[PDB]
């Protein structure tokens, strides 16, 4: 199976309250492993996965430094942007960034990513070549000139094709038994009347990893793609996820309907009916 | 392992 590393940055300005807040979170696949908040008691990188706790003091010192240096830089960035858009200090503003590398079900690098946003809108993004930038508006074109002059695309390519890959591989081995082995869903079907002769058949899926899951209803052999209430995949809060798919069926006609589950941890796609 | 940057990486 494929694996990917991602870091997520949020830089929020908050004038009238004080200096901007910087939050950084690292993910391997759907597992968060590190967090860094500028507002925490003593700003340092904190472990969020068990397998990363084996990394030495040298690892946490360096991460700490790197994030502390970004604290000042994204604060600086927030002034620069407030300068390009000519924005007053009357408003709170947000810089978002996400970068990282994907690996194939083979271990080999598939591609790299580096995207940034301002006030929730695309701002600047690294291209597929890792040599150039796409700017969204003319404010980002000033950023583009700054980054070209300083050859920043170089730094990123050295990371995405280099450090990003090597470190991801290290993390994948260090915690292979939670990062490379997949948790299958715990599936069942509930029956619940909502009238005097038409009832709900809800297909539950609980305790699975990663979040990738397909839940579908079928009658006679045809997908009920129309008449299905389908919730968003939701975190259980214990490194597992949840989802269900529900359909309203005419009473005494339950056993025409079948739920279908597709998920990495399942050796084969599962078929379920309601069990009287 | 985060992306190292520093000044000149500012927006």
């Amino acid at each position, epitope marked *: 199976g494929s694996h990917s590393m991602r870091y997520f940055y949020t830089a929020m300005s908050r004038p009238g309250r004080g200096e901007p807040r910087f939050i950084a979170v690292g993910y391997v696949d759907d597992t968060q492993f590190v967090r860094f908040d500028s507002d925490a008691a003593s700003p340092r990188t904190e472990p969020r996965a068990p397998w990363i706790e084996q990394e030495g003091p*040298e690892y946490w*010192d*360096r991460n700490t*430094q790197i994030f*502390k*240096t970004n604290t*000042q830089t994204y604060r600086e960035s927030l002034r620069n942007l407030r300068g390009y858009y000519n924005q007053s200090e009357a408003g709170s503003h947000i810089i978002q960034r996400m970068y990282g590398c994907d690996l194939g079900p083979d271990g080999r690098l598939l591609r790299g990513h580096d995207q940034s946003a301002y006030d929730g809108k695309d701002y600047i993004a690294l291209n597929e070549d890792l040599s150039s930038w796409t700017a969204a508006d003319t404010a980002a074109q000033i950023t583009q000139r700054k980054w070209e002059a*300083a*050859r*920043v695309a*170089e*730094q990123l*390519r*050295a*990371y995405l094709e*280099g*450090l990003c890959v*090597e*470190w991801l591989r290290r993390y994948l081995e260090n915690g292979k038994e939670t990062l490379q082995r997949a948790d299958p869903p715990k599936t069942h079907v509930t029956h619940h009347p909502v009238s005097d002769h038409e009832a709900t058949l809800r297909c539950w899926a609980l305790g699975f990893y990663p979040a990738e899951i397909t839940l579908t209803w079928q009658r006679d052999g045809e997908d009920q793609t129309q008449d299905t209430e389908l919730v968003e995949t939701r975190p259980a809060g214990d490194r597992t996820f949840q989802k269900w798919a529900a359909v309203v069926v005419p009473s005494g006609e339950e056993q025409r309907y079948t739920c279908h589950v597709q998920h990495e941890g399942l050796p084969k796609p599962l078929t379920l009916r309601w069990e009287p | *392992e985060p992306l*190292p*940057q*520093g*000044q*000149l*990486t500012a927006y």
Partner: T-cell receptor
Amino acid sequence: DAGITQSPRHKVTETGTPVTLRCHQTENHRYMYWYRQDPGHGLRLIHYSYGVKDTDKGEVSDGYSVSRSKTEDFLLTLESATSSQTSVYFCATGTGDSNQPQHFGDGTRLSILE
Amino acid sequence: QNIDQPTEMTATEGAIVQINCTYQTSGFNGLFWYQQHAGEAPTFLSYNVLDGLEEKGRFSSFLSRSKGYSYLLLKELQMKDSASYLCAVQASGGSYIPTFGRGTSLIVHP
């Protein structure tokens, strides 16, 4: 002279004596470094700073102390100078960017005698 | 990081010298070359992070990431090229702080 000024340039002190070297910059670089150069060895890191009041140890930090009270200056103190600290000392500055060079100061010939 | 380069090399003016530098580095995030004259500060020559041969005047810089090998090739050797040549490596190991090898003394003979 790339904005970097070291003082003193030459100094001769007695062993067991406080000594301080000054590194000053005019370019606002977030990172500053103190290295030493010894025959047989290359440049070896003593201490470095990644911002005002942000400092860490290099390879040869024993007997050395540093302060980055402001951006302009990175100061190097040897509390009790030993004859082993007899060396040429280089200070450097940088933007922090992994693809940018360090800019080195002109050096300091420091001799410590019994 | 164990940066490793020859102590001393010797050539005559007009020739071509290759200065090897090998590093044992996982966490590699770039290689720097510096020219240092005796009694003077080191000055920047090249930054190398990609595999390949990079020409900048009469100086070339080579890097092979897989094998941890880099050379600096000086052509049309001149009297002023007489100097020490520094190999610097930035790694995850310490921090991405340029760590220096012992340097290579080059003597250019007239």
